[PDB]
């Protein structure tokens, strides 16, 4: 649950992402894969990437970063009223991709890391607080759907 002022902060931060969605999406995925290499194994189309240089050179990885962040942005713009948008993603991630909730924690922290890395000094303490709460709400509503499905 976020206040109006917190949502305003989230959507202000998101304007930074929308100015370069592919570059942000690329770096989020690279941070996830390099920090948590077990996550790479869930992607049949990226498991061939052995080095970060290959990850950086991959145009398909940048494309997928755009898909991921476009979906997240659509959810965030709903300010918590995201049941219709979140349900298919919870279902596909539990039943088809088999993504444990832990990996959604990993990517949430990776988003925070990338924002500080690309906007040092321009991602303030209030903005970090509000973005963190928004990603927690996203993860928590996914977790509720995971429990319904019995997925661990
Ligand atoms: C911010 C969180 C995330 C968002 C919004 C997101 C969004 C999406 C979207 C929109 C798709 C394509 C449609 C679909 O299959 O439902 C996708 C595919 C996928 N997601 Fe996620 N995702 C997230 C986190 C993750 C994480 C943490 C993992 C794994 C560590 C992951 C693994 C996958 C895989 C395996 C695919 C299929 C890729 C394919 O072969 O083309 N997702 N995701």
Curated annotation (Swiss-Prot):
One of its GO terms (biological process) is oxygen transport. Belongs to the globin family. It comes from Equus caballus (Horse). One of its GO terms (cellular component) is sarcoplasm. Transmembrane segments: none annotated. It is an enzyme of class 1 (oxidoreductase). The gene is MB. Monomeric heme protein which primary function is to store oxygen and facilitate its diffusion within muscle tissues. Reversibly binds oxygen through a pentacoordinated heme iron and enables its timely and efficient release as needed during periods of heightened demand. Depending on the oxidative conditions of tissues and cells, and in addition to its ability to bind oxygen, it also has a nitrite reductase activity whereby it regulates the production of bioactive nitric oxide. The keyword Heme applies. CDD domains: Mb. It is found in: Cytoplasm, Sarcoplasm. It catalyses: Fe(III)-heme b-[protein] + nitric oxide + H2O = Fe(II)-heme b-[protein] + nitrite + 2 H(+); H2O2 + AH2 = A + 2 H2O. It comes from the Eukaryota. Its EC number is 1.7.-.-, 1.11.1.-. Monomeric. Keywords: Cytoplasm, Heme, Iron, Metal-binding, Muscle protein, Oxidoreductase, Oxygen transport, Phosphoprotein, Transport. The modification Phosphoserine is found at residue 3. Nitrite binds at residue 64. O2 binds at residue 64. The keyword Metal-binding applies. This is Myoglobin. Residues 1-147 form the Globin domain. InterPro entries: Globin, Globin-like_sf, Myoglobin.
